[PDB]
Amino acid sequence: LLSDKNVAIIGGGPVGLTMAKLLQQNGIDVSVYERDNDREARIFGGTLDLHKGSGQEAMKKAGLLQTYYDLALPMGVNIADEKGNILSTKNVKPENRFDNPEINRNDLRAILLNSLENDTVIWDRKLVMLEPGKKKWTLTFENKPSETADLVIIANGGMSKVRKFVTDTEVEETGTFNIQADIHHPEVNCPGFFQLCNGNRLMAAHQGNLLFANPNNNGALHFGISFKTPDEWKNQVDFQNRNSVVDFLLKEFSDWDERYKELIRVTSSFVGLATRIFPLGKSWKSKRPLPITMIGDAAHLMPPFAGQGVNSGLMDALILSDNLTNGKFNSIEEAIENYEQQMFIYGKEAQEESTQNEIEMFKPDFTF
Ligand SMILES: Cc1cc2c(cc1C)N(C[C@H](O)[C@H](O)[C@H](O)COP(=O)(O)OP(=O)(O)OC[C@H]1O[C@@H](n3cnc4c(N)ncnc43)[C@H](O)[C@@H]1O)c1[nH]c(=O)[nH]c(=O)c1N2
Ligand SMILES: CCCCCNC(=N)N/N=C/c1c[nH]c2ccc(OC)cc12
């Protein structure tokens, strides 16, 4: 199918890099175009864990499952209330230690980058436009020379603006909002909350405000505070202004234990982000001018609160890469169609669980 042809993957996130590995290890000529300036760019966010049957199956097929295991950390979960009482402690039993250990996102990028041949990823390449030719796409990048490919795979995340050859679907806001931050040396800077986590991830919910924390993301504490988007914000917190963010959060958390307030007070900077979804519904465009598809969040971005996210994208890469290389399809288009039909099933399943969970967890009286 791909002999004497080449593949362009747009985006070097965990899904795109996994895509590249699974193609390249079957002898496919594939490049990844990534907007990040270079591989040393820090990725902001919590940890990821990979699941048996999906994310771990993609690593296994790439020969990287042990590498993931060696850099990942099994973590228990504590459920606390707003007063700081631990309502539930579930540690990881040894027989479950491979189920879904947490890995830092930069560590995961490094594993995948190290598995690829040199110069597979072309850095500082922000795709802005695609144009189909007779047999090859032309790729236009921001202030860089163009490239061509027989097959384009869109893998550049939930806010991709290069989707229109595949679908007219637009991303949507779901109505919840997320504030995220890191605390370095949390054992010094938020000792009370750090000891509350006690090596476990911690979650707590009270009157429509949700808090989730990881006390040990490669030595830092990552936490997220989520809530229904305030109506006053429709169409007011400047997240560049930590003093404005601290003031808002301290009002929201006014009846939470001081160990939670300390987290807010000592945070150096905050990142805010509306929850969004790229909804799978009616089929994507049929009879596209040249072969093109999408994987990962570009295909099915969904709320993250129940753990859906990267694993459905890693499934995409596993399925699409097998269809493109197993010699069973008469054309790249047919291989793509088969992947998309499968992804519509498990992707819709995951989106409905994520949306249902979001409705439930943000009811004003929810508790874990
Ligand atoms: C607050 C919060 C919390 C979580 C999560 C989301 C959010 C918002 N998720 C979701 C999860 O992290 C997500 O599913 C994966 O990052 C998807 O990876 P992708 O590679 O598809 O896109 P991702 O967005 O990770 O990567 C896209 C890549 O494309 C690049 N790019 C963008 N535009 C480009 C362009 N024009 N040209 C070239 N490159 C371009 C970007 O720089 C980036 O490297 C999650 N999931 C999970 O499984 N477990 C979890 O715990 C969480 N937690
Ligand atoms: C299925 C195994 C778990 C993997 C990831 N699992 C997860 N739960 N990722 N969560 C992200 C998140 C962002 N903001 C929040 C606010 C509240 C909250 O409560 C759980 C969670 C979040």
Domain that holds residue 260: 173-275
- Say if residue 150 carries a ligand binding annotation: no
Query: Does residue 115 share a domain with residue 264?
Result: no
> With contact defined as beta carbons under 8 Å apart, do 150 and 10 qualify?
no
Report how far ligand 1's centroid is from the alpha carbon of 202 (Å).
Answer: 22
Report the distance separating Cα 103 and Cα 16, nearest Å.
17
Q: Is the residue at 88 inside a domain?
A: no
Q: Is the CB of 54 under 6 A from ligand 2?
A: no
Q: Is the residue at 91 inside a domain?
A: no
Q: Is the CB of 354 under 6 A from ligand 2?
A: no
Q: Is the CB of 303 under 6 A from ligand 1?
A: no
Query: Does residue 223 share a domain with residue 303?
Result: no
Query: Does residue 320 share a domain with residue 299?
Result: yes
What is the helix (H) or strand (E) element at residue 132, kind and residue range?
strand 127-132
Which residue's CA is the closest to the ligand 1 atom numbered 53? Answer: 304
Report the distance separating Cα 234 and Cα 218, nearest Å.
36
Which residue's CA is the closest to the ligand 2 atom numbered 7? Answer: 307
Q: Which of 245, 275, 305 is the last residue of a domain?
A: 275
HSE, side-chain direction, 13 A CA sphere, residue 146 = 12
Residue 254's domain is classified under what CATH number? 3.30.9.30
Report how far ligand 1's centroid is from the alpha carbon of 311 (Å).
Answer: 11
Q: Which of 275, 305, 320 is the last residue of a domain?
A: 275
Token pair, residue 61, equals 């097929």
Report how far ligand 2's centroid is from the alpha carbon of 179 (Å).
Answer: 13
Q: Which of 215, 243, 275 is the last residue of a domain?
A: 275
Q: Which of 35, 211, 6 is nearest to 123 (CA)?
A: 35
Residue 16's domain is classified under what CATH number? 3.50.50.60
- Ligand 1 nearest-atom number relative to CA 141: 37
Instruction: Give the residue carrying structure tokens 């911690």.
Output: 202
What is the number of the ligand closest to the CA of 13? 1
Report how far ligand 1's centroid is from the alpha carbon of 258 (Å).
Answer: 33
Token pair, residue 234, equals 């429709």
- Say if residue 97 carries a ligand binding annotation: no
Q: Is the CB of 178 under 6 A from ligand 2?
A: yes
Find the DSSP H helices in the chain.
14-24, 55-62, 65-71, 105-115, 186-189, 191-197, 242-252, 258-266, 297-300, 310-325, 332-361
Report the distance separating Cα 324 and Cα 25, nearest Å.
12
- Write the CA distances from 169 to 158, 226, 299, 300, 340, integer angstroms: 12, 26, 10, 11, 15
Query: Does residue 124 share a domain with residue 16?
Result: yes
In angstroms, what is the resolution? 1.9
Query: Does residue 221 share a domain with residue 125?
Result: no
Task: Measure the CA dihedral 307/258/227/178, to 10°.
Answer: -60
Task: Find all residues with CB under 8 Å of 283, minimum gap 6, and list them.
Answer: 344
User: Residue 73 gets which letter from DSSP?
Assistant: B
Token pair, residue 199, equals 């090596």
- Say if residue 39 carries a ligand binding annotation: no
22 phi and psi angles, rounded to 5 deg: -65, -30
Q: Is the CB of 226 under 6 A from ligand 2?
A: yes
Query: Does residue 68 share a domain with residue 52?
Result: yes
Q: Is the residue at 80 inside a domain?
A: no
Report the distance separating Cα 321 and Cα 269, nearest Å.
40
| Mutation probe of ligand 2 site: the residue of 180, 305, 367 with most atoms within 8 A of C-beta | 305
| Tally of domains in the chain | 2
